[PDB]
Enzyme design. Structure first.
Site, mmCIF file in Angstrom:
data_model
loop_
_atom_site.group_PDB
_atom_site.id
_atom_site.type_symbol
_atom_site.label_atom_id
_atom_site.label_comp_id
_atom_site.label_asym_id
_atom_site.label_seq_id
_atom_site.Cartn_x
_atom_site.Cartn_y
_atom_site.Cartn_z
ATOM 1 N N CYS A 206 -45.158 -14.691 -13.985
ATOM 2 C CA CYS A 206 -44.071 -15.657 -14.105
ATOM 3 C C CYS A 206 -43.698 -16.273 -12.760
ATOM 4 C CB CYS A 206 -42.846 -14.982 -14.726
ATOM 5 S SG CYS A 206 -42.646 -15.304 -16.494
ATOM 6 N N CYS B 226 -39.421 -15.461 -11.138
ATOM 7 C CA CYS B 226 -39.177 -14.331 -10.248
ATOM 8 C C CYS B 226 -39.253 -14.793 -8.796
ATOM 9 C CB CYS B 226 -40.197 -13.219 -10.501
ATOM 10 S SG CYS B 226 -41.912 -13.785 -10.556
#
Length: 104
Positions: A30, A33
């Site tokens: 992802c 983050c």
């Protein structure tokens, strides 16, 4: 200094060894983050009353089931080793109010 816990019990341990604990349950595949870390860093030095740690779902799937993680990324604050609040979507401003509320 956001803390990364690679153990399941260690994860739960952090939750119980402190009054208030904020953890970013996230995934390595992802981008949020990385995008949420920069602001998260600022939050970590002023909000030092609250303990910040990071727990991935791939390393300890049991953790995901423990907190019934359905959506991601999810930011949860724990009080007395229990879930107290939840924040959907890694947002600097959203976490600002969430982290500030219990931490600030």
């Amino acid at each position: 200094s956001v803390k990364i816990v690679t153990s399941q019990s260690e994860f739960d341990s952090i939750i119980s060894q402190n009054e208030l604990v904020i953890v970013d349950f996230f995934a390595e595949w992802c981008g949020p983050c990385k995008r949420i870390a920069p602001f998260y860093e600022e939050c970590s030095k002023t909000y030092t009353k609250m303990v910040f740690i990071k727990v991935d779902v791939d390393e300890v799937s049991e953790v995901t089931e423990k907190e019934n993680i359905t959506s991601m990324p999810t930011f949860k604050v724990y009080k007395n080793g229990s879930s107290v609040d939840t924040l959907l979507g890694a947002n600097d401003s959203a976490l600002k109010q969430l982290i500030e509320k219990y931490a600030a």
